[PDB]
């Protein structure tokens, strides 16, 4: 029953809200639940010239996109995971159900 | 042999193989993270991708 559920989003607040919602659902389920595994945050960096020209001061701008990933381990079959994860999901988060 | 001479030049590589997604321009293309845009239009549509500017 070693299953691993990934949870990725652009946002931090809604990610932690849906993580705490799933954690309190598993705790009200009376099931052995593992904690959240905070993955290291990957940053996508793009530096480019602000101007469309070649005229002016040599000025650059910086673009970022942080990626946050969380892991949840559970000890239930797939239908319990479906019935606990198909309700009240944040629009920024995404899931991936695996079994191992 | 016009049907085999009109496209006789290979375009497997080089600058003409790449094309901009928005304006079909061969200049100033970014290939990082599979974006395939010119720099100016990436700056124009930078907000709705998710790329924010806070550094």
């Amino acid at each position: 029953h070693r299953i691993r559920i990934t949870l990725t989003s652009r946002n931090v607040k809604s990610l932690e809200k849906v993580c705490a919602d799933l954690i309190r659902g598993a705790k009200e389920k009376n099931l052995k639940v593992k904690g959240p595994v905070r993955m290291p945050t990957k940053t996508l960096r793009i530096t480019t010239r602000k101007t469309p020209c070649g005229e002016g001061s040599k000025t650059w701008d910086r673009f970022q996109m942080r990626i946050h990933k969380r892991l949840i381990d559970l000890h239930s079959p797939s239908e319990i995971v479906k019935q606990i994860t198909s309700i009240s999901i944040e629009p920024g988060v995404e899931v991936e159900v695996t079994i191992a | 042999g016009h049907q085999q001479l009109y496209w006789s030049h290979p375009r497997k590589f080089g600058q003409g193989s790449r094309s901009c997604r928005v304006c079909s321009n061969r200049h100033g293309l970014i290939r990082k993270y599979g974006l395939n845009m010119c720099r100016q239009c990436f700056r124009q549509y930078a907000k709705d991708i998710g790329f924010i500017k806070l550094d």
Binding site: I67, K69 | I49
Partner: peptide, 19 residues
């Protein structure tokens, strides 16, 4: 999925479809 592009490519493509 066999091709299985990366996490960064997923967000870049999602921004492309949204734009």
């Amino acid at each position: 999925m066999a091709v299985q592009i990366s996490k960064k490519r997923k967000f870049v493509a999602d921004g492309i479809f949204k734009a």
